[PDB]
Every structure is written in structure tokens, then in C-alpha cells.
Design an enzyme around this catalytic site. Structure first.
Site, PDB file in Angstrom:
ATOM      1  N   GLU A 178      49.103  19.878   2.802  1.00 17.92           N
ATOM      2  CA  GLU A 178      49.637  19.520   4.106  1.00 17.92           C
ATOM      3  C   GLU A 178      50.910  18.691   3.973  1.00 17.92           C
ATOM      4  OE1 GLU A 178      49.099  20.732   6.965  1.00 17.92           O
ATOM      5  OE2 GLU A 178      47.123  21.649   6.791  1.00 17.92           O
TER       6      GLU A 178
ATOM      7  N   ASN B  10      57.394  21.508  15.293  1.00 17.06           N
ATOM      8  CA  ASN B  10      57.147  22.933  15.518  1.00 17.06           C
ATOM      9  C   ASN B  10      57.932  23.323  16.761  1.00 17.06           C
ATOM     10  OD1 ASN B  10      54.604  23.110  13.599  1.00 17.06           O
ATOM     11  ND2 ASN B  10      54.258  21.347  14.965  1.00 17.06           N
TER      12      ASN B  10
ATOM     13  N   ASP C 264      56.332  25.416  19.909  1.00 13.97           N
ATOM     14  CA  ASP C 264      55.499  24.903  21.008  1.00 13.97           C
ATOM     15  C   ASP C 264      55.756  23.441  21.370  1.00 13.97           C
ATOM     16  OD1 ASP C 264      54.133  23.712  18.826  1.00 13.97           O
ATOM     17  OD2 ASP C 264      52.211  23.845  19.849  1.00 13.97           O
TER      18      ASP C 264
ATOM     19  N   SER D 277      55.478  20.595  19.610  1.00 12.17           N
ATOM     20  CA  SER D 277      54.562  19.591  19.103  1.00 12.17           C
ATOM     21  C   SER D 277      55.003  19.202  17.695  1.00 12.17           C
ATOM     22  CB  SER D 277      53.115  20.111  19.107  1.00 12.17           C
ATOM     23  OG  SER D 277      52.958  21.234  18.247  1.00 12.17           O
TER      24      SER D 277
ATOM     25  N   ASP E  54      53.490  17.543  13.839  1.00 12.81           N
ATOM     26  CA  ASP E  54      52.364  17.234  12.960  1.00 12.81           C
ATOM     27  C   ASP E  54      52.737  15.934  12.278  1.00 12.81           C
ATOM     28  OD1 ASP E  54      51.072  19.733  13.394  1.00 12.81           O
ATOM     29  OD2 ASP E  54      52.615  20.673  12.145  1.00 12.81           O
TER      30      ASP E  54
ATOM     31  N   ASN F   4      48.182  17.195  14.607  1.00 13.39           N
ATOM     32  CA  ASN F   4      48.993  17.648  15.746  1.00 13.39           C
ATOM     33  C   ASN F   4      48.964  16.810  17.041  1.00 13.39           C
ATOM     34  OD1 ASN F   4      49.588  19.914  18.081  1.00 13.39           O
ATOM     35  ND2 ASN F   4      50.699  20.394  16.200  1.00 13.39           N
TER      36      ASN F   4
END
Length: 130
Positions: free
Chosen positions: A35, A46, A49, A51, A53, A60
């Protein structure tokens, strides 16, 4: 903070992650590794959309933490996403425990399915004395 492999393993074990909801410590190590590379300050936007992380488990902002700019987001972990960028991983772990309390469990992270599921993950905790 960029954790050393065995340093993180011992830390996660002390935080009660070994076997949490049936998930072994080595699976959590495999997850953190792919990750963010054991890096607590990693963030990833991202654009698709809107959002982001955050942190070592790349959690998220749409469902787990609040950063105020993600549309129709919820804050299930009841935390500011900023908390998931500290060197001390206590809150990030508390939030990761929440995520797996949902039906999907560890599968909530796609990278886990791609690089950890059905694989020999023993190599992540070997020699760390955990």
C-alpha cells in the site's frame, strides 16, 4: 516515517493486530508493504472519484476519515484524515481494525487481493521475533 520491516512487525503485534478478525500479522505486513512501502506520510489522490488514500494502510476519505473535500463522504472511523499521517500509527491501526469489521474484511483493499491473497506471506515477518 518510513518503518523498517521488523520494526513495524513488532509494533503491529503490540497493537493487537495479530489474528484480528482472523487476519494474521503477516497479512497486515503484506498490506502495508504494497500500500505505501511502510511509509506513514504517503497520500494518493484518485482524480477519478475525488477521494484520497491516507497513510500506511492507504485508507480512503470517502468512507473512513474526513478531509472535508471528498463528495458525499462519511467518516466511519470518526477521525480527521490528518491523524492517519502521524509517525505514531495508533489511530491508523484503530481505523484499520474498523475497516475489517465490515463483511469484506481484509478484501476491502484491492492490492491485498493482487499481491497477498493465496501467496506465501511468511517472508514478511521472518526473523523479526514476533
Amino acid at each position: 516515517k518510513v518503518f523498517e520491516r521488523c520494526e513495524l512487525a513488532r509494533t503491529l503485534k503490540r497493537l493487537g493486530m495479530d489474528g484480528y478478525r482472523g487476519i494474521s500479522l503477516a497479512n497486515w505486513m503484506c498490506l502495508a508493504k504494497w500500500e505505501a512501502g511502510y511509509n506513514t506520510r504517503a497520500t494518493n489522490y484518485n482524480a477519478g472519484d475525488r477521494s484520497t488514500d491516507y497513510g500506511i494502510f492507504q485508507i480512503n476519505s470517502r468512507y473512513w476519515c474526513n478531509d472535508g473535500k471528498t463528495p458525499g463522504a462519511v467518516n466511519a472511523c470518526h477521525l480527521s484524515c490528518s491523524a492517519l499521517l502521524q509517525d505514531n500509527i495508533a489511530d491508523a491501526v484503530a481505523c484499520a481494525k474498523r475497516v475489517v469489521r465490515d463483511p469484506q474484511g481484509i478484501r476491502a483493499w484491492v492490492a491485498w487481493r493482487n499481491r497477498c491473497q493465496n501467496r506465501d506471506v511468511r517472508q514478511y515477518v521472518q526473523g523479526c521475533g514476533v
